[PDB]
Nucleic acid binder design. Structure first.
Ligand code: MG
Ligand code: MG
Ligand code: MG
Ligand code: MG
Ligand code: MG
Ligand code: MG
Ligand code: MG
Ligand code: MG
Ligand code: MG
Ligand code: MG
Ligand code: MG
Ligand code: MG
Ligand code: MG
Ligand code: MG
Ligand code: MG
Ligand code: MG
Ligand code: MG
Ligand code: MG
Ligand code: MG
Ligand code: MG
Ligand code: MG
Ligand code: MG
Ligand code: MG
Ligand code: MG
Ligand code: MG
Ligand code: MG
Ligand code: MG
Ligand code: MG
Ligand code: MG
Ligand code: MG
Ligand code: MG
Ligand code: MG
Lengths: 216, 40, 99, 97, 154, 110, 78, 116, 144
RNA sequence: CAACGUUGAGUUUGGAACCCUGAACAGACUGCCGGUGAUAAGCCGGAGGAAGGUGAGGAUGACGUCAAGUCAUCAUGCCCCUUAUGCCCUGGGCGACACACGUGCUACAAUGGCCGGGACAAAGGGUCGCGAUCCCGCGAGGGUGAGCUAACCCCAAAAACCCGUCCUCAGUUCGGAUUGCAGGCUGCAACUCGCCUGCAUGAAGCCGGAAUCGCUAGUAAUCGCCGGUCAGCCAUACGGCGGUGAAUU
């Protein structure tokens, strides 16, 4: 059967929103469009500028808070050694482009990068990791178990990892999943970080879903 | 009868107010049916 | 869908921007001004601008995908993308609602 | 001066109200309170699936809450104390004078 | 109804006469849940029955229902690969139900003008035992007794 | 009273009696009755004066013969024209923009 | 009180052809445009979607549209 | 097709495929036997044909016939077959139908003494 | 005329008075001022039998909380009502009366709890559920 | 809530005492009593209580099944087209028509149909918008345009119900198809193919064979109101809101 994105299930209980703004119903469509444009930009830039310098760049999430004056972007990021160490620091170099995109009329932009302490207590980062290893034609067993290890030494109470597609390039697709510790998906009180990710292989697409249970 | 566009009912169902089902008291309805003279 | 449909739409928008106030003007002109044989020529003016200049010719498509059907206006988005994005919490104020 | 706050999430708007009400309580101007207005709640429903099945729906709302705050007498200090105030990025303020 | 049985519901009293019976019949006469109309129809039936005869209509009720109340009916049983009509005996509430029902049924089929006229016609004909709603009950008995041999719980 | 336009309203209220003429619906009936003549009774209770008034008033609006040949010459004309509506009148298929895949039954019965 | 409709190109074509007093075949795609008395005795070939069908205009035609006279759907039998 | 079966609705639907005259006649014959003897019960025969494989798709050349029977009383007789040739498939379905039918007739119409 | 009887019998608005009760059921809300002397039923500046249409049922609902007592000639009732239809307004009037009655004298409790007039009726309309015609009504359904 | 007076009201006073709004909090846990039960979980009853044994509805859908559905939302392996299998345009077409199958509306009438006069909702939507008032039209609509970025103003008439007056058994004052005439609106464009009005027309159809579907209480039945899509709509659809309110186990 189908479950609900455990993100969406708890909204306004144990999980905040990402875009924190408000708009009158007409402007709502426009504003949403703007958020999409800058999320697009900021993902593209970081992808191209970090994967040229050969590193694993966690982009954990993008929080956007619109105020009448200044629109502020907070990047939750796992390893900003790639973004900070380059000479044109990501702050300014992105500030210029992201402010090219939305508008500068009545709105100026502020970029603030946040270091998420434990990178492997976040699903999104971890799934980018497995995506890297499976893009390397490492067997999925090894990748799964490495992820499990890194994470359970990274302080996690429970985790469930699913990988679906043509596995090892074999002709008939399948679904392989591992549950570890304790992961209630039905308990609304439980803090649950979910993430979905997609990979492009020689053999076509591969999906990864990850559940992380941080406690109540 | 609800399928009658000549009746208040049928207008009200068809969502067209018209000669039969008037907007206000000042819009002329169809020619009056008022007179009858029973006595006794 | 096809890129070319989104392009058709863009070009319609642009043309409607060009001829917008001309349309309002010839419209209030044929509305307010009598003399039927005069309205022949002002409706000869109406029929000159490109058929892609009419506001009834514009068509709203979802701005992420471009899906021509199923567009709930407030979000300028098609139902599916709208839904996934309700689950990744990109929509401010959006909550699964049980009344 | 009457301000109409409108925001989605509750904690942000009542905290923002707490800031305004205490910043106008400090500067000694009289306040007619954080009067709750009726919550306006929009329902939309959409097809769960990308094809076919018509009975799979998804109901989601948007809840907007409206607070009203009436400050009676506008001191120079009161106007400046409430024009300076820092209100979180998810609340909207309307000032009718 | 496989698991739970039914709890009892408050037996009401008709507003004018404080009766359980009259309220039973105004509930069974109901259609599209307009009680406004049902009460009117039944009260004009009491008016025509007090018009035709000088006897207390409150009694003509008990005569009408004592008259058409079946004490026995049959039921289809599957016994030994054989399909039997078995004369199962009827409870009291079910008796009053059946009564009110054949009364109302034969009342809806009358040739007349109003419903108050029909209902009064049939209360008048059932209180004397003179009509279709009593005939129907007696047929149920006729077909209960011809089948009397098939009750082994006898 | 037979005299009104060769036809027979019979033993009823006057309006719904007058309606039996082809050419009189609900509107012309209560208009003629409650505006010009002014009287509402049974049919056979109509005094000679009121009756004369009625005949004289109903004589200025079209009737069975006239209307039947009127719509007949409209339909005829359209059939000669060879327009679309006419093609449909000739063929026996609905011309008002109704779909032919399912229910023509009223008009297909012929 | 409201105008009837006729397409521009068509109206000036029939204008020129009525002025120069000749009967010529006019190929038109306006199935919309009304037949205005100033066009009678003309032969107008209207688009049915593939072929242009010639139609001869009569006194009777006026007040109608053009595409009434050009059958679009090809149907004979089952 | 049959007169004694005239009371029955024979519905022949190509799904992905084009129906010929020989397919028609063959359907009438093989479903014909199946139903004819048990006709008194039978009501509606729904036959769908699904072809796949060869030049159309991946996998073997499969032609799959689904039939469905209803009786005046019992519903839902479902028969699904996969084979090489349409003809083969139909023969298979008829083989199944016959069995299910005479199972129904067997159960109910036996005056089966069922005591319980 | 009745507006002046209600206005002159009650100077202090609908809030001030000592003995009050509020019924609510379905979408109908009714605020009930109880008074001493005679008896009259004024519902929204109109009479009981006027407003409630004289459907014996509804009248009986309104007059029932006073019949378990016998105070019909001892009390005078003025109520204002909005929301819903008239049945629910009748019920709400019944309840609000029961509450005002427990406000006057607390010894009325034992009759009113045996009759069951003190309980707010919780039954309200069930929402429309998607894929269904109304509430529990499913579309006409073909097995085939 | 009351008052002053008006149908335009005021912002014109007091009250925060009723209601309502929406924020915090309390309340229901077999918690208490009695009876049962190996002591056990519980099961029948009783008290208090607005509520009593998941109090009522909703979101919630395990491991998996059907190589179910979807490459026409989106993404994608591979294959294939690439002066055409891509792209611009105006007309058609998706709306055809011997029939067959399914979902729906209106019905066949006095528990009813027509008319006139009275009463009571909820929830919604609304600045390229909703549009009061007034004026012209029998009428859709047309001219005028307050007020309102919405507990303020508008859509807005709720309809069933009720007091009266007609029909009291008819293919009718039932039912309203079909079709003609004359128009209104949207829109460059209403013939194929929009919707709405006025006059006329007045088909079938007397509760429907075999079979079969929905429902356990605010439910069925029955009455209307709103929304989204939207220049205009094919909406009787779909998503909601309330009015009246059963029988049965
Ligand atoms: Mg599963
Ligand atoms: Mg009628
Ligand atoms: Mg309509
Ligand atoms: Mg109208
Ligand atoms: Mg007028
Ligand atoms: Mg594409
Ligand atoms: Mg459009
Ligand atoms: Mg048991
Ligand atoms: Mg309802
Ligand atoms: Mg509700
Ligand atoms: Mg459906
Ligand atoms: Mg519906
Ligand atoms: Mg005050
Ligand atoms: Mg108890
Ligand atoms: Mg519960
Ligand atoms: Mg649960
Ligand atoms: Mg599959
Ligand atoms: Mg398929
Ligand atoms: Mg492709
Ligand atoms: Mg092609
Ligand atoms: Mg085209
Ligand atoms: Mg279609
Ligand atoms: Mg067509
Ligand atoms: Mg009325
Ligand atoms: Mg709308
Ligand atoms: Mg207007
Ligand atoms: Mg007939
Ligand atoms: Mg009849
Ligand atoms: Mg069933
Ligand atoms: Mg159940
Ligand atoms: Mg629309
Ligand atoms: Mg329909």
């Amino acid at each position: 059967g189908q479950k609900i994105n455990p993100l969406g299930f708890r909204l306004g209980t144990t999980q905040s929103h990402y875009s924190l703004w408000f708009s009158q119903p007409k402007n709502y469509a426009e504003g949403l469009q703007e958020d999409q444009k800058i999320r697009d930009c900021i993902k593209n830039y970081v992808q191209k500028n970090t994967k040229t310098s050969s590193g694993v760049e966690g982009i954990a999430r993008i929080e956007i808070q619109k105020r009448i004056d200044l629109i502020q972007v907070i990047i939750h990021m796992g390893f900003p050694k790639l973004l900070i160490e380059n000479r044109p620091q990501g702050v300014e170099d992105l500030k210029i482009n992201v402010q090219k995109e939305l508008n500068c009329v009545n709105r100026k932009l502020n970029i603030a990068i946040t270091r998420i302490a434990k990178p492997y207590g976040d699903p999104n980062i971890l799934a980018e990791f497995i995506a890297g290893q499976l893009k390397s034609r490492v067997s999925f067993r090894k990748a799964m178990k490495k992820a499990i290890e890194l994470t359970e030494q990274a302080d996690t109470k429970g985790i469930q990892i699913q990988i679906a597609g043509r596995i090892d390039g074999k002709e008939i697709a399948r679904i392989e999943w591992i549950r570890e510790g304790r992961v209630p998906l039905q308990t609304i009180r439980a803090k649950i970080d979910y993430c979905a990710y997609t990979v492009r292989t020689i053999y076509g697409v591969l999906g990864i879903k990850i559940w992380i249970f941080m406690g109540e | 009868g609800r399928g009658d566009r000549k009746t208040a009912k049928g207008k009200r169902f068809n969502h067209s107010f018209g000669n039969a089902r008037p907007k206000n008291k000042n819009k002329g309805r169809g020619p009056p049916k008022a007179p009858i003279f029973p006595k006794g | 869908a096809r890129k070319s449909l989104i392009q058709r739409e863009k070009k319609r928008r642009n043309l409607e921007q060009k001829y917008h106030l001309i349309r309002r003007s010839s419209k209030q002109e044929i509305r307010k001004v009598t003399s039927l044989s005069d309205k022949w020529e002002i409706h000869g003016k109406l029929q000159s601008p490109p058929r892609n200049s009419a506001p009834a010719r514009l068509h709203r498509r979802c701005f992420l995908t471009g899906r021509p059907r199923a567009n709930i206006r407030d979000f300028g988005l098609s139902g599916h993308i709208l839904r996934e994005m309700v689950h990744t919490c990109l929509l401010p104020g959006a909550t699964r609602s049980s009344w | 001066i009457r301000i109409k706050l409108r925001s989605y999430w509750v904690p942000l708007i009542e905290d923002s109200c707490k800031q305004i009400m205490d910043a106008a309580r400090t500067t000694n101007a009289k306040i007619m309170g954080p009067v709750p207005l009726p919550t306006k709640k929009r329902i939309y429903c959409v097809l769960k699936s990308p094809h076919v099945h018509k009975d799979a729906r998804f109901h989601f709302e948007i809840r907007t809450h409206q607070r009203l705050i009436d400050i009676l007498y506008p001191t120079a200090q009161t106007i400046d104390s409430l024009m300076q105030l820092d209100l979180p990025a998810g609340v909207d303020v309307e000032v009718k004078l | 109804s496989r698991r739970g049985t039914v709890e009892e519901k408050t037996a009401k009293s008709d507003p004018i006469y404080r009766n359980r019976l009259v309220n039973m019949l105004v509930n069974r006469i109901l259609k599209h849940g307009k009680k406004s109309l049902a009460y009117q129809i039944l009260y004009r039936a009491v008016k025509k029955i007090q018009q035709k005869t000088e006897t207390n209509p409150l009694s003509v009720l008990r005569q009408a229902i004592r008259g058409v109340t079946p004490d026995i009916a049959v039921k289809a049983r599957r016994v030994g690969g054989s399909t039997h009509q078995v004369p199962i005996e009827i409870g009291s509430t079910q008796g009053k139900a059946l009564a009110i029902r054949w009364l109302l049924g034969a009342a809806r089929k009358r040739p007349g003008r109003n419903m108050a006229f029909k209902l009064s016609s049939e209360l008048v004909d059932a209180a004397k035992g003179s009509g279709d709603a009593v005939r129907k009950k007696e047929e149920t008995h006729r077909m209960a007794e011809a089948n009397r041999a098939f009750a082994h719980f006898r | 009273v037979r005299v009104g336009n060769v036809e027979i309203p019979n033993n009823k209220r006057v309006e719904y009696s007058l309606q039996y003429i082809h050419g009189i619906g609900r509107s012309r009936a209560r208009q003629i009755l409650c505006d010009l003549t002014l009287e509402n009774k049974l049919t056979k209770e109509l005094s000679e004066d009121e009756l004369l008034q009625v005949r004289d008033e109903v004589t200025k609006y079209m009737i069975e013969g006239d209307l039947r040949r009127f719509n007949a010459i409209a339909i005829r004309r359209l059939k000669e024209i060879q327009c679309y509506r006419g093609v449909r009148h000739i063929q026996g298929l609905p011309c008002r923009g109704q779909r032919t895949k399912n229910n023509c039954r009223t008009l297909k019965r012929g | 009180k409201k105008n009837p409709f006729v397409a521009n190109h068509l109206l000036r074509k029939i204008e020129k052809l009525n002025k120069k007093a000749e009967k010529e075949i006019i190929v038109t795609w306006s199935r919309a445009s009304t037949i205005i008395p100033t066009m009678i005795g003309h032969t107008i070939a209207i688009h049915n979607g593939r072929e242009h069908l010639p139609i001869y205009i009569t006194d009777r035609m006026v007040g109608h549209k053009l595409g009434e006279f050009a059958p679009t759907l090809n149907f004979r039998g089952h | 097709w049959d007169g004694p079966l005239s009371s029955v609705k024979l519905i022949l639907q190509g799904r992905n495929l084009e129906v010929s005259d020989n397919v028609r006649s063959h359907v009438e014959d093989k479903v014909g036997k199946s139903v004819a003897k048990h006709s008194h019960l039978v009501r509606e025969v729904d036959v769908r044909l699904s072809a796949r494989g060869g030049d159309l798709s991946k996998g073997p050349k499969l032609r799959r016939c689904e039939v469905t029977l209803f009786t005046k009383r019992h519903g839902v007789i479902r028969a699904e077959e996969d084979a090489e040739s349409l003809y083969s498939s139909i023969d298979l379905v008829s083989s199944i139908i016959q069995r299910k039918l005479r199972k129904i007739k067997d159960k109910v119409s036996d005056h089966g003494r069922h005591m319980k | 005329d009745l507006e002046k009887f209600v206005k002159s019998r009650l100077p202090g608005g609908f809030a001030a008075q000592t003995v009050i009760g509020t019924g609510r059921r379905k979408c109908a809300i009714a605020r009930v001022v109880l008074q001493e002397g005679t008896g009259k039923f004024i519902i929204n500046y109109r009479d009981a039998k006027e407003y409630l249409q004289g459907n014996p049922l509804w009248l009986q609902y309104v007059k029932t909380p006073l019949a378990t007592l016998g105070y019909e000639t001892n009390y005078d009732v003025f109520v204002k009502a909005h929301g819903g239809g008239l049945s629910g307004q009748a019920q709400a009037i019944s309840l609000g009366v029961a509450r005002a009655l427990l406000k006057v004298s607390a010894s009325h409790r034992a009759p009113l709890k045996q009759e069951g007039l003190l309980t707010r009726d919780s039954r309200i309309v069930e929402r429309k559920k998607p894929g269904l015609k109304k509430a529990r009504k499913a579309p006409q359904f073909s097995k085939r």
